[PDB]
Design a protein around this ligand. Sequence first.
Ligand SMILES: *[C@@H]1O[C@H](CO)[C@@H](O[C@@H]2O[C@H](CO)[C@@H](O[C@@H]3O[C@H](CO[C@H]4O[C@H](CO)[C@@H](O)[C@H](O)[C@@H]4O)[C@@H](O)[C@H](O[C@H]4O[C@H](CO)[C@@H](O)[C@H](O)[C@@H]4O[C@H]4O[C@H](CO)[C@@H](O)[C@H](O)[C@@H]4O[C@H]4O[C@H](CO)[C@@H](O)[C@H](O)[C@@H]4O)[C@@H]3O)[C@H](O)[C@H]2NC(C)=O)[C@H](O)[C@H]1NC(C)=O
Ligand SMILES: *[C@@H]1O[C@H](CO)[C@@H](O[C@@H]2O[C@H](CO)[C@@H](O[C@@H]3O[C@H](CO[C@H]4O[C@H](CO)[C@@H](O)[C@H](O)[C@@H]4O)[C@@H](O)[C@H](O[C@H]4O[C@H](CO)[C@@H](O)[C@H](O)[C@@H]4O[C@H]4O[C@H](CO)[C@@H](O)[C@H](O)[C@@H]4O[C@H]4O[C@H](CO)[C@@H](O)[C@H](O)[C@@H]4O)[C@@H]3O)[C@H](O)[C@H]2NC(C)=O)[C@H](O)[C@H]1NC(C)=O
Ligand SMILES: *[C@@H]1O[C@H](CO)[C@@H](O[C@@H]2O[C@H](CO)[C@@H](O[C@@H]3O[C@H](CO[C@H]4O[C@H](CO)[C@@H](O)[C@H](O)[C@@H]4O)[C@@H](O)[C@H](O[C@H]4O[C@H](CO)[C@@H](O)[C@H](O)[C@@H]4O[C@H]4O[C@H](CO)[C@@H](O)[C@H](O)[C@@H]4O[C@H]4O[C@H](CO)[C@@H](O)[C@H](O)[C@@H]4O)[C@@H]3O)[C@H](O)[C@H]2NC(C)=O)[C@H](O)[C@H]1NC(C)=O
Ligand SMILES: *[C@@H]1O[C@H](CO)[C@@H](O[C@@H]2O[C@H](CO)[C@@H](O[C@@H]3O[C@H](CO[C@H]4O[C@H](CO)[C@@H](O)[C@H](O)[C@@H]4O)[C@@H](O)[C@H](O[C@H]4O[C@H](CO)[C@@H](O)[C@H](O)[C@@H]4O[C@H]4O[C@H](CO)[C@@H](O)[C@H](O)[C@@H]4O[C@H]4O[C@H](CO)[C@@H](O)[C@H](O)[C@@H]4O)[C@@H]3O)[C@H](O)[C@H]2NC(C)=O)[C@H](O)[C@H]1NC(C)=O
Ligand SMILES: *[C@@H]1O[C@H](CO)[C@@H](O[C@@H]2O[C@H](CO)[C@@H](O)[C@H](O)[C@H]2NC(C)=O)[C@H](O)[C@H]1NC(C)=O
Ligand SMILES: *[C@@H]1O[C@H](CO)[C@@H](O[C@@H]2O[C@H](CO)[C@@H](O)[C@H](O)[C@H]2NC(C)=O)[C@H](O)[C@H]1NC(C)=O
Ligand SMILES: CCC(CC)[C@H](NC(C)=O)[C@@H]1[C@H](O)[C@@H](C(=O)O)C[C@H]1NC(=N)N
Ligand SMILES: CCC(CC)[C@H](NC(C)=O)[C@@H]1[C@H](O)[C@@H](C(=O)O)C[C@H]1NC(=N)N
Ligand SMILES: CCC(CC)[C@H](NC(C)=O)[C@@H]1[C@H](O)[C@@H](C(=O)O)C[C@H]1NC(=N)N
Ligand SMILES: CCC(CC)[C@H](NC(C)=O)[C@@H]1[C@H](O)[C@@H](C(=O)O)C[C@H]1NC(=N)N
Ligand SMILES: [Ca+2]
Ligand SMILES: [Ca+2]
Ligand SMILES: [Ca+2]
Ligand SMILES: [Ca+2]
Ligand SMILES: [Ca+2]
Lengths: 388, 388, 388, 388
Amino acid sequence: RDFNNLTKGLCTINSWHIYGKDNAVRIGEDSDVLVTREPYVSCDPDECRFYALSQGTTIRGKHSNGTIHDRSQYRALISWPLSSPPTVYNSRVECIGWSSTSCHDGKTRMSICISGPNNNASAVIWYNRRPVTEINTWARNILRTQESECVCHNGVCPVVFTDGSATGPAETRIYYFKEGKILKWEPLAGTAKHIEECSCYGERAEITCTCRDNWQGSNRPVIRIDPVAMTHTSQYICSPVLTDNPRPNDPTVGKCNDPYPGNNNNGVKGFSYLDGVNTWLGRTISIASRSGYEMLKVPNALTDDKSKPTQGQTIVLNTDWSGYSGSFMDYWAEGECYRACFYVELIRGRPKEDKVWWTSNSIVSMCSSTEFLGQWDWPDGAKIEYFL
Amino acid sequence: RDFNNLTKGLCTINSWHIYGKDNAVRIGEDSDVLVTREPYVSCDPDECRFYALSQGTTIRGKHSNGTIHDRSQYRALISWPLSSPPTVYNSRVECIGWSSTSCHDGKTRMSICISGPNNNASAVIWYNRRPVTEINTWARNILRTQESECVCHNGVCPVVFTDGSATGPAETRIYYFKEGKILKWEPLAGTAKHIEECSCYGERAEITCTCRDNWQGSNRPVIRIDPVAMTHTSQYICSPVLTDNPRPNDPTVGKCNDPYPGNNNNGVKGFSYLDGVNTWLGRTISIASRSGYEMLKVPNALTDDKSKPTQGQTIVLNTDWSGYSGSFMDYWAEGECYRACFYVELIRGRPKEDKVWWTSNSIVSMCSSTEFLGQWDWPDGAKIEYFL
Amino acid sequence: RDFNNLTKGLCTINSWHIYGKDNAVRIGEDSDVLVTREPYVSCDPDECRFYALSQGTTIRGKHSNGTIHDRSQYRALISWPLSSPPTVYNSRVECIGWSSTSCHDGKTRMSICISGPNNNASAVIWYNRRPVTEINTWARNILRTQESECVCHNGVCPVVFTDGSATGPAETRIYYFKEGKILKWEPLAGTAKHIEECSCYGERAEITCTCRDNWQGSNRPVIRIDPVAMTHTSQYICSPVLTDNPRPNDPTVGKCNDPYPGNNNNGVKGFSYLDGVNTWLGRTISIASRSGYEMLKVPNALTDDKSKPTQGQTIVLNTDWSGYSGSFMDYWAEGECYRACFYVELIRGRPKEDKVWWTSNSIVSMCSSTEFLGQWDWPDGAKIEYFL
Amino acid sequence: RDFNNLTKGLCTINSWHIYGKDNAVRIGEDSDVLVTREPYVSCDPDECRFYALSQGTTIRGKHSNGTIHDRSQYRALISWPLSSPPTVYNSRVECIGWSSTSCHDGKTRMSICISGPNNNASAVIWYNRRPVTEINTWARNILRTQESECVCHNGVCPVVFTDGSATGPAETRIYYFKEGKILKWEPLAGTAKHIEECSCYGERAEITCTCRDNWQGSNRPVIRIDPVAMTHTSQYICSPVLTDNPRPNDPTVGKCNDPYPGNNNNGVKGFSYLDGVNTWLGRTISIASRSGYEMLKVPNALTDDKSKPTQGQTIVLNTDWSGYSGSFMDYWAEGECYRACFYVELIRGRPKEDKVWWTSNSIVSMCSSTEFLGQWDWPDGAKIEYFL
Ligand SMILES: *[C@@H]1O[C@H](CO)[C@@H](O[C@@H]2O[C@H](CO)[C@@H](O[C@@H]3O[C@H](CO[C@H]4O[C@H](CO)[C@@H](O)[C@H](O)[C@@H]4O)[C@@H](O)[C@H](O[C@H]4O[C@H](CO)[C@@H](O)[C@H](O)[C@@H]4O[C@H]4O[C@H](CO)[C@@H](O)[C@H](O)[C@@H]4O[C@H]4O[C@H](CO)[C@@H](O)[C@H](O)[C@@H]4O)[C@@H]3O)[C@H](O)[C@H]2NC(C)=O)[C@H](O)[C@H]1NC(C)=O
Ligand SMILES: *[C@@H]1O[C@H](CO)[C@@H](O[C@@H]2O[C@H](CO)[C@@H](O[C@@H]3O[C@H](CO[C@H]4O[C@H](CO)[C@@H](O)[C@H](O)[C@@H]4O)[C@@H](O)[C@H](O[C@H]4O[C@H](CO)[C@@H](O)[C@H](O)[C@@H]4O[C@H]4O[C@H](CO)[C@@H](O)[C@H](O)[C@@H]4O[C@H]4O[C@H](CO)[C@@H](O)[C@H](O)[C@@H]4O)[C@@H]3O)[C@H](O)[C@H]2NC(C)=O)[C@H](O)[C@H]1NC(C)=O
Ligand SMILES: *[C@@H]1O[C@H](CO)[C@@H](O[C@@H]2O[C@H](CO)[C@@H](O[C@@H]3O[C@H](CO[C@H]4O[C@H](CO)[C@@H](O)[C@H](O)[C@@H]4O)[C@@H](O)[C@H](O[C@H]4O[C@H](CO)[C@@H](O)[C@H](O)[C@@H]4O[C@H]4O[C@H](CO)[C@@H](O)[C@H](O)[C@@H]4O[C@H]4O[C@H](CO)[C@@H](O)[C@H](O)[C@@H]4O)[C@@H]3O)[C@H](O)[C@H]2NC(C)=O)[C@H](O)[C@H]1NC(C)=O
Ligand SMILES: *[C@@H]1O[C@H](CO)[C@@H](O[C@@H]2O[C@H](CO)[C@@H](O[C@@H]3O[C@H](CO[C@H]4O[C@H](CO)[C@@H](O)[C@H](O)[C@@H]4O)[C@@H](O)[C@H](O[C@H]4O[C@H](CO)[C@@H](O)[C@H](O)[C@@H]4O[C@H]4O[C@H](CO)[C@@H](O)[C@H](O)[C@@H]4O[C@H]4O[C@H](CO)[C@@H](O)[C@H](O)[C@@H]4O)[C@@H]3O)[C@H](O)[C@H]2NC(C)=O)[C@H](O)[C@H]1NC(C)=O
Ligand SMILES: *[C@@H]1O[C@H](CO)[C@@H](O[C@@H]2O[C@H](CO)[C@@H](O)[C@H](O)[C@H]2NC(C)=O)[C@H](O)[C@H]1NC(C)=O
Ligand SMILES: *[C@@H]1O[C@H](CO)[C@@H](O[C@@H]2O[C@H](CO)[C@@H](O)[C@H](O)[C@H]2NC(C)=O)[C@H](O)[C@H]1NC(C)=O
Ligand SMILES: CCC(CC)[C@H](NC(C)=O)[C@@H]1[C@H](O)[C@@H](C(=O)O)C[C@H]1NC(=N)N
Ligand SMILES: CCC(CC)[C@H](NC(C)=O)[C@@H]1[C@H](O)[C@@H](C(=O)O)C[C@H]1NC(=N)N
Ligand SMILES: CCC(CC)[C@H](NC(C)=O)[C@@H]1[C@H](O)[C@@H](C(=O)O)C[C@H]1NC(=N)N
Ligand SMILES: CCC(CC)[C@H](NC(C)=O)[C@@H]1[C@H](O)[C@@H](C(=O)O)C[C@H]1NC(=N)N
Ligand SMILES: [Ca+2]
Ligand SMILES: [Ca+2]
Ligand SMILES: [Ca+2]
Ligand SMILES: [Ca+2]
Ligand SMILES: [Ca+2]
């Protein structure tokens, strides 16, 4: 095998079609399904799988109580076959930790898991299913990473990490790995003022990441990385179609180089595909909570500060719970272009549904179509009342 | 690998022998078996598997309530090892949707799943386990397909779809796929007046499909496809041995080019092997409900409007529930001929057994023998009372 | 791969060492373990597995009630990894039926399953996991076979079947298969008067089978097959150490060419290794019931009508339940000789333990050692009281 | 494949990073997890797995009652995927017995299991998943072995066994196996006075084992083996940092060639990495019970009788239960040195937690880092109260 190179551009996105859905919470009501959160999807050259951070207990197990908590010693990055649920018996552990990222470079997979107490966390970088490199916390305040797949080009796989306050200036670093080893790292540059949980994709030798400004911005920061030069830039999506959550109502003009104000110290992982007129943004429908999900076609959203939608697609109704969302692509598919894909985490349980003592999620995932396909909505589908 | 070509004829069918049986409802009474319906069987060059549309819940799970419903967002095409039951832990999801078909072309497998609301459904065509092509609804009324395997010849795999009313004229199309891409499509032609759920098989470079005329006919429509010319014809099985359900009692003369009247707006997926004197038809024993199943040897059933049985075999007693049935063959077996095979869906639960709130099924499947073998009956075997 | 040839002799048996044990009934008390009976062991060139006839229900399932019954439509030959229990999720179905045999010829495996009502049963012969040949009942009275592995030599795999009364003269046939096809068959010849459930092994191009004379004999019939000439002989083990069950007490002189009288119309599957002074016989310890199990070294047991034990080994104490036993060997191991192996079925439930409504078993299996190893006893280990 | 040779030295150990953790007791509260004890980790050239002695029952099963017992007929050596829990459905049985060791030589794996009553136990040596050699008890008093991986060099895999009293002089033998056959064996020599459960690792063609002197010593015996000459030496870790348990408080001077007194007839399996200044010792934090676990850097611990710690790392808090610990390395990783790894058995249930009737454990495992990483503590995490 040779290292994969990002030689293709994105396919034209005219609509989104269903790709995978695991119905984990429904199925888990009466089967040994692990409690998870922070899911994502990632492809190898011969298979695509679902990934997530387990909580080290099943949903019906008594240890599900307290799983709203983010960072215990019982978490791990797990992967499992596309559209099956994450069960005790089919889930493969990639590494131990409570924050992760993973990607295949064309030869083998790199997986990164961070563990430890808030003031002394460390990242372990695995390559070919073996630990290769370790990185200690640099700001002693919850060293953390993407929560979705990284992207590689000619063996170089850039990864974005953050260490420091989630509600003020922090120390974000872009690491450039090759075979699990560090080639280089650099501090965040550009005009993004705070970075969290970047969702990335690659096309024509450039990696684009859409992140979460948890401090002040309701517009999303964007990091663009050149994996050959091992350099990057940062800015915000200029469009007035605001895509973080919670957020204020949409204005008529957005901000390109500063956080769009109105909501502080909160946010949600999200993503976008920024490709001129072929630009689509995801967002929750609600401006106040992680409810609903929609895709909006917003031509030149990255650079046009008055850009508005020209087409859309509802993914999850506003009467259903959503959550994190992120990008991935099958870089090893046939054809001349890369088909944009995304997943949405459908969070169930606490804190929105507090009649149960757990927090878990199911996954729904779509990929783009060049047809203009009809839309449906894709809820988690479980009845909370059954778990009481 | 090379594309498979339909170079052989059917073996002489002198009786049927047991091929597979999963006892899913019995086993599922105390194990994590998924609720399914619309099952089928399909072979790859190195393995044969059971397929079905999951309902995204186990049978003992509380989400089994309401699984008589046909088209939710929680359904998916799943496959699992021959004769094992469809469990949470052994079921592989092929695609998401509530109507499907799947077939191997000798190189890799094509799987098709349709999802969406009644007025805006779409088909996603997967090839080599990746989405390749998408087709939007053309009549905005439950775009739908076979519910059993398709058949390929030199890489061309024809598939029959229907969109429109189930109880009047509809728009049926025959699509010719190759590597998941559309080579051509054509509207139904011939004298069949309504087509649903075709069950197909191939021999000597011709594909024969036996379908369900849900509108007016109790005789079954037959579509014969030339996968090289990419053309087809349609008619009805001429025989007076009527094989849909419900249906009127058998007459002495059938109809070749029009629906045999007596029952409207209802039916059941079924199949036949139409090979001159080597012709065998399946049907429910009851004329009123999906109960029992038998195979009848009816020489020249396709073209002789007075043809009657010359031999038979009971598969399921009339005191046991049956359901959908369809054809498949192992195109990669050894020998000089293709051995005809079929499955019968054994439906349990609603609406016939309404003491339970679910609907599921188990599978029984047979293949032909050149011997004249003794017969047995093969019920689902589960006791409904145990689920109360 | 080439067909395996029986070129080696048996290793010297000086004691028996533990080979596998699944603890199925213990584990199945709280996990999804299938109810089985009539187990055996069989090796492929790269793996050895446990086999048995499932009853199509778990042990804790409500459908376990009534599993003392021998021949339902819900049975199947299943195989699973050595020493794991037969679970819903790890059990591979080989074929459907209530009587079986299976063996690997060095290239691929042949598996045979018989199904049907008592007066109309049929055998389906599978080869390379596909049905190849079918055989109809010839005496219309429970067509049946070995219940343990067959043995192959240069692709020829002889199999012993019986059809007819279990308590009087019956029609026993020896079939010679090659690639699942019938080369030849012949009626039983020699002085054995009734044959059931032969347990076979091969060495130096000769296959030896030890069977169950269910009609009159408490000594076991022996069939010796030449798989090149496709011919056989039959007689009884001459020794006065009687090895069927139930049986009368041991006399001082046995019978070579007639059934040793005392007990009629009953028996148990068993085995022996008949190799001059390297001869070892298995048997239940009790003369009245399937309780205990021991191995006895009885030099020249086949031909010496006064031969008595010169060494022994207890396998299962007389205060523990045993059941069927049979021979198998790993024909693909390293070294210059074939190591004799056997299994013992540890039956639990009915009819001996009727506080439960089911009948199942676990497996224990040993192979010979050239050392004189210490002995232990190997009970099933489950507590019936826990299942109440 | 070629036999692996121990050509590299140990990497510099500056801290320990998380490697694997299965959370088995937490997960097993509501899933079919086997009861185990005496776990370890061992790598093949393409995968690393967890190993343990099953008790042949799940933790929630009624047969979990009485699993404090060490040596039943229902135990077996099982292996399962790294960091998954040992479940009924994912656990592979390697051999049957109640004492084991296992290692890969670069070509295939050797696994050894001992079974039998106290006065008549025997070892069966498996190679390439087949039984090859058997060894009978030589002192008729619980023949027993390492309970952690063995190490191979150019196909020679030395294994340490003990037979005889656990509380006085016993007969310890070092066996040198190659392809499962005995090349040679020799009685223990040197100044170690009693040996149990050696934990071994290899580097630069030398194998170092740290053992448990159950009779008189609270310092640990050390056996150093030359696998080419097939010779060994023995002594004790000289350091005053005592690492068995229970043990007296640390003195200022230890003993090099005799047991450090204070505690008799008790101990716990443990390990060390003895590499000059790159020396790290593991031990329980408590001197009285199997509680807590810490790693201490003790330069020249093997040869310096006043050596004290210069650095440390807490693995398990003293308020959490620990248990056995042992060494393993991935001998097939990339790079120029071997990365030291270890596991800690986290024992739950009896005898410390007697509100439950079972005894089981979970596993935590770490490997060394050349960074100075922050530390966390890694408890089992299960709540005993949930099992009541
Ligand atoms: C069969 O399926 C097909 C295919 O899916 C169906 O056709 C689809 O129908 C969709 C629904 O109508 C449609 O999606 C909409 O597209 C609009 C763009 O098109 C229109 O404008 C362009 C540009 O002028 C024209 O060319 C075009 O012809 C249309 O006129 C979007 O504008 C739509 O999104 C907005 O509305 C929805 C509510 O429906 C909001 O959720 C969404 O966020 C957008 O509105 C908010 O945002 C904008 C931008 O800032 C504001 O201006 C606006 O006030 C809203 O703001 C409030 O709400 C947000 C969200 O809560 C909040 O943050 C903010 O603060 C404010 O409170 C929508 O995306 C598909 O494009 C169309 N597809 C095709 C190919 O046709 C067909 O209907 C189906 N058939 C049947 C029978 O069902
Ligand atoms: C051991 O096993 C062997 C092998 O299986 C057993 O032998 C099998 O025995 C079967 C049962 O007898 C037999 O199957 C029958 O075959 C008949 C054909 O053979 C006869 O006719 C030919 C032609 O003349 C002769 O050559 C031949 O020798 C025989 O005489 C079929 O006609 C049979 O089917 C009809 O009967 C069954 C009821 O038994 C119906 O369910 C079935 O649908 C058929 O009847 C309906 O349909 C016809 C056609 O329209 C009507 O004319 C008729 O009135 C019936 O219609 C009513 O019912 C239907 C269904 O509900 C409804 O739709 C309609 O409106 C009406 O209400 C049957 O198939 C096997 O061929 C035979 N095999 C061999 C190789 O011998 C042996 O018995 C076993 N041994 C033991 C001891 O058990
Ligand atoms: C550590 O482990 C080692 C290795 O396992 C242990 O050593 C083993 O010890 C075993 C038990 O003593 C021993 O097995 C016995 O071997 C006898 C043969 O050896 C003796 O005879 C020869 C020939 O003369 C001598 O060379 C030799 O030195 C000995 O003297 C067998 O004869 C034994 O079997 C008979 O006894 C058992 C009861 O113990 C019966 O269950 C068994 O069926 C045999 O007896 C019945 O059958 C014979 C034959 O017809 C009759 O003559 C007799 O009356 C019995 O019949 C009744 O019972 C049967 C069964 O219910 C019934 O059908 C019938 O109708 C009647 O009612 C036995 O096999 C191993 O050989 C020996 N191994 C070695 C290598 O030494 C050591 O003890 C262990 N250490 C500790 C400390 O435990
Ligand atoms: C972020 O993470 C980093 C990295 O992990 C954290 O930094 C680590 O901090 C650890 C805790 O302080 C530290 O570990 C200690 O290291 C000591 C060695 O360093 C000191 O001495 C050297 C040599 O002079 C200096 O160079 C160095 O600068 C330091 O001064 C060890 O000595 C420590 O172990 C002893 O203490 C612990 C209690 O903390 C005991 O459990 C342990 O067993 C040791 O003490 C017993 O044993 C000795 C030896 O016999 C006795 O002398 C002593 O009295 C104790 O004996 C009693 O207890 C034992 C055990 O119960 C019993 O058997 C006996 O009988 C007696 O009852 C300890 O290992 C790491 O090295 C350090 N790492 C780095 C790289 O810095 C940082 O803190 C984290 N940050 C935050 C904010 O949390
Ligand atoms: C991605 O591009 C790199 C860089 O050009 C390709 O790398 C070359 O691969 C060939 C084939 O193995 C080698 O002969 C060269 O030595 C490689 N290195 C360089 C720098 O040229 C790589 O093959 C490309 N990937 C694919 C899938 O084509
Ligand atoms: C078992 O013996 C048969 C018969 O001698 C061997 O068969 C020959 O195999 C070789 C190798 O494939 C062929 O060239 C011959 O044509 C085969 N047939 C005969 C009749 O000679 C077979 O190889 C032996 N099996 C093994 C494992 O050696
Ligand atoms: C404290 C910093 C937060 C990110 C901005 C926090 N990240 C981590 C590693 O803890 C996330 C946030 O608290 C949770 C959420 O917003 O859903 C998930 C939670 N993420 C994870 N548990 N992996
Ligand atoms: C409305 C059109 C019907 C076919 C003629 C209908 N098909 C679909 C896709 O919904 C089927 C029919 O209602 C059910 C049955 O007859 O058993 C199954 C049902 N089929 C599926 N759920 N896949
Ligand atoms: C009626 C003839 C019997 C053999 C001599 C009978 N065989 C079959 C195929 O039914 C066996 C016997 O009744 C049972 C037993 O003795 O344990 C098992 C039972 N065997 C099986 N259920 N496979
Ligand atoms: C009697 C000798 C003991 C070792 C010094 C004893 N070993 C065996 C094979 O029984 C161990 C000891 O009793 C137990 C413990 O200390 O945890 C485990 C127990 N080990 C095992 N059950 N495998
Ligand atoms: Ca924000
Ligand atoms: Ca109809
Ligand atoms: Ca359960
Ligand atoms: Ca008898
Ligand atoms: Ca000690």
